[PDB]
Amino acid sequence: KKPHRYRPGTVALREIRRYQKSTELLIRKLPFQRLVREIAQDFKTDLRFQSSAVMALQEASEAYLVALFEDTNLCAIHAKRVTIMPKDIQLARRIRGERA
């Protein structure tokens, strides 16, 4: 009984406090940049991007996902659960009126 081990509630809630008290970007920059370039390949061939444009996309996309997981967590709590499910994301986007 020498290696110490925590509980599943503790480490999760410490991560919640840590990433709520921080401001930095959480998605890696180069995979997100390759994702934006691959999605932009369909609408027009041979784009060019500015660094500020890709950073603005990443800021807005991470803020959108954090608000989406806020409503997802509320939908999970409302069903007497704590674990989020794809039903919660579909319900949050169906009440936001974005299913199109």
């Binding site: 809630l13 919640i16 709520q20 401001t23 603005a56 800021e59 803020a63 709590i77």
Partner: protein, 59 residues
């Protein structure tokens, strides 16, 4: 934002201070509801059901 900077022991307003300044106020949050501020984050607000019960049984 100057009150949020003074609370954080800083003499320079960073976008975290503008984020805490707007979102803690209710009329500025109503004004800037559909507005994202870059390098802000979110409010440190944890729901009261995800915390473990740090209480003692009276019986």
């Amino acid at each position: 934002a100057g009150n949020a900077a003074r609370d954080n022991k800083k003499t320079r307003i960073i976008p975290r201070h503008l984020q805490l300044a707007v979102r803690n106020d209710e009329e500025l949050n109503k004004l800037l509801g559909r507005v994202t501020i870059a390098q802000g984050g979110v409010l440190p607000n944890i729901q009261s059901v995800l915390l473990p019960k740090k209480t003692e049984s009276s019986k």
